[PDB]
Swiss-Prot record:
Origin organism lineage: Eukaryota, Metazoa, Chordata, Craniata, Vertebrata
Full-protein interval shown: 1 to 226 of 732
Family: Belongs to the heat shock protein 90 family.
Outcome when changing G103D: Abolishes ATPase activity
Organism name: Homo sapiens
Residue ranges, annotated region (Interaction with NR3C1): 15-232
Modifications after synthesis and translation: ISGylated. S-nitrosylated; negatively regulates the ATPase activity and the activation of eNOS by HSP90AA1.
Name of this protein: Heat shock protein HSP 90-alpha
Domain of life: Eukaryota
Length: 232
């Protein structure tokens, strides 16, 4: 039956097979759960230092590239720049910290981002009770959780040369999940996506982001770049 022209909907290609993502759910180590509750539900005056904490994690992951080269020169062949990108999305109310560091395996997410007790956790909670500044968090080993000063939910997408791409996610409440991520490949590195709380939207503003980077993170050691969406 002759055709001279087809509608879009007719030549619509059949979907790729549905992907299966394996998901697992884990409880946070008891004292990590306690700290996340404390961080979430207490007022702190200097919440901006969350960005100094995640930038530091990124910087540490990038320093690992340079040293891992000494025992695996393969990585010198990568053409990827060692850098950090800050991506506020006013539309979705997210701030995303992206790096091209070494990334995390599945077991690294499960162990490093919640299941293994940290020996400073108790001491830091005591310090906060006794009125320490929240800024001291990173010296107690638990600075990743400062994300929950500003974020109601945090998703971490990551890819390590030794594993497949995974997503960790938690809205606190005592648990997190790790799942395989068959979504947009990142190549190598980690993206931390902060879903900001309703009253913490100043961290999507480019001036505010520039201010806190200048104040707290001016020895990162790698280029940091802020992507600003053009105002329509
Ligand atoms: N951007 C990142 N890249 C690689 N690993 C990270 C990143 N963010 C957090 N982590 C891991 O999570 C850990 C949290 O505690 P640490 O800073 O001691 O060590 C950190 C890393 O192991």
């Amino acid at each position: 039956v002759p055709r001279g022209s087809h509608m879009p909907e007719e030549t619509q290609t059949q979907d790729q097979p549905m992907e299966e993502e394996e998901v697992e759910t884990f409880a946070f180590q008891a004292e990590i759960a306690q700290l996340m509750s404390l961080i979430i539900n207490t007022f702190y005056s200097n919440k901006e230092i969350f960005l100094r904490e995640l930038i530091s994690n990124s910087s540490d992951a990038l320093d690992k590239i340079r040293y891992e080269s000494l025992t695996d020169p393969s990585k010198l062949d990568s053409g990827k720049e060692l850098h950090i990108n800050l991506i506020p999305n006013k539309q979705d109310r997210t701030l995303t910290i992206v790096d091209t560091g070494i990334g995390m395996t599945k077991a690294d997410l499960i162990n490093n981002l919640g299941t293994i007790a940290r020996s400073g956790t108790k001491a830091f909670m005591e310090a906060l009770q006794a009125g320490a500044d929240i800024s001291m968090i990173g010296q107690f080993g638990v600075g990743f959780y400062s994300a929950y000063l500003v974020a109601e939910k945090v998703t971490v997408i990551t890819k390590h040369n030794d594993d497949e791409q995974y997503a960790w996610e938690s809205s606190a409440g005592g648990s997190f999940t790790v799942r395989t991520d068959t979504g947009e490949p990142m190549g190598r590195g980690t993206k931390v996506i902060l879903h900001l709380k309703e009253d913490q939207t100043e961290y999507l503003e480019e001036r505010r982001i520039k201010e806190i980077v200048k104040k707290h993170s001016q020895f990162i050691g790698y280029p940091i770049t802020l992507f600003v969406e053009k105002e329509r």
